[PDB]
Design a protein around this ligand. Structure first.
Ligand SMILES: CC(=O)N[C@@H]1[C@@H](O)[C@H](O)[C@@H](CO[C@@H]2O[C@@H](C)[C@@H](O)[C@@H](O)[C@@H]2O)O[C@H]1O
Length: 294
């Protein structure tokens, strides 16, 4: 409610009140910003991480690996400081593929070596921590390696570390996945990719995790419309009948959730089926913060 009705970037006491709102109890908003769509990567992009709304809690840096070096330069030198100025946490996202890479030894030394290499992706940018994207089951060997790496990371990130840095588990699977059963003690937040899902199915999914967390750790995810992407239908008009909107309102029975996140926050407000790149004032993000914290 100390948040702007447009997308101003407040400067003094207007900003301080937003800095205090964020230290206060609230349902948090998170956004995956696709790095290859940042104006500092390639050409033809319309949106910068500098445009992210002041009332955002976490920005994920989600690369695909063909971003131009200019992106990483701007992230370290410009973007991270300005987002930290707005009290926005910046977190690097990486796929589970990275933690089960067989180029790294499946041994204590190997789990530590790999954790060191992922920790460079955090420390070299002054980031607030690391997000691991899990969308697959693992064999015994993969499970063993991923668990080892989570356990090595847990020394520097998340609840076991005492650093204040985040260790995030984001997934489209449930709390029965063996990796989850191995690593839940290491986790800051768990984010459920819930694109195009039943409002009626939400409780069932939460219940699969609720024994391993408090409800403030749990966030649910909708997607914005990706240019040439899957039509999940999470952002239909009118807004206040959207799946995203109903996600902002949903609470598990007898408890309050952590909040929600968007995939492709860089696509906030682009109509479903509009495959061109546009700018955004982050209307949906800002509305959806209001919807969770009225
Ligand atoms: C093969 C393919 O297209 N895979 C995509 C993933 O690339 C994408 O991240 C994922 C995102 O949506 C999540 O997973 C799906 C299966 C479903 O459970 C959604 O509700 C989740 O949000 O979509 C895959 O289909």
């Amino acid at each position: 409610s100390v948040c702007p009705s447009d997308n101003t970037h407040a400067t003094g006491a207007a900003l301080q009140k937003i800095l205090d709102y964020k230290k206060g109890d609230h349902q948090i908003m998170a956004g995956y910003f696709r790095s290859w769509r940042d104006t500092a990567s390639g050409t033809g992009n319309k949106v910068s991480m500098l445009d992210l709304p002041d009332c955002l809690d976490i920005a994920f840096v989600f690369p695909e690996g063909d971003e131009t070096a200019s992106f990483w330069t701007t992230l370290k030198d410009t973007y991270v400081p300005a987002l930290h100025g707005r009290g926005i946490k910046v977190v690097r996202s990486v796929g589970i593929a990275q933690l089960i890479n067989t180029a790294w030894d499946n041994t204590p030394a190997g789990w530590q070596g790999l954790a060191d290499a992922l920790m460079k992706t955090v420390d070299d940018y002054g980031l607030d921590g690391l997000d691991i994207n899990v969308q697959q089951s693992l064999n015994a060997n993969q499970l063993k390696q991923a668990t080892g790496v989570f356990n090595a990371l847990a020394k520097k990130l998340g609840p076991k570390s005492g650093t204040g840095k985040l260790l995030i588990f984001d997934t489209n699977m449930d709390g029965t996945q063996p990796l989850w059963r191995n690593v839940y003690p290491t986790i800051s937040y768990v984010l459920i990719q819930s694109y195009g899902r039943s409002i009626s199915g939400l409780q069932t999914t939460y219940n699969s995790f609720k024994s391993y967390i408090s409800s403030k750790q749990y966030l649910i995810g909708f997607s914005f419309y990706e240019e040439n992407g899957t039509n999940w239908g999470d952002t239909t008009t009118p807004m206040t009948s959207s799946r995203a909107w109903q996600y902002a309102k949903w609470q598990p029975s007898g408890a309050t959730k952590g909040g929600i996140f968007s995939y492709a926050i860089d696509r906030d407000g682009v109509a479903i089926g509009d495959n061109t790149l546009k700018t955004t004032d982050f209307t949906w993000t800002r509305q959806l913060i209001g919807a969770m914290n009225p």
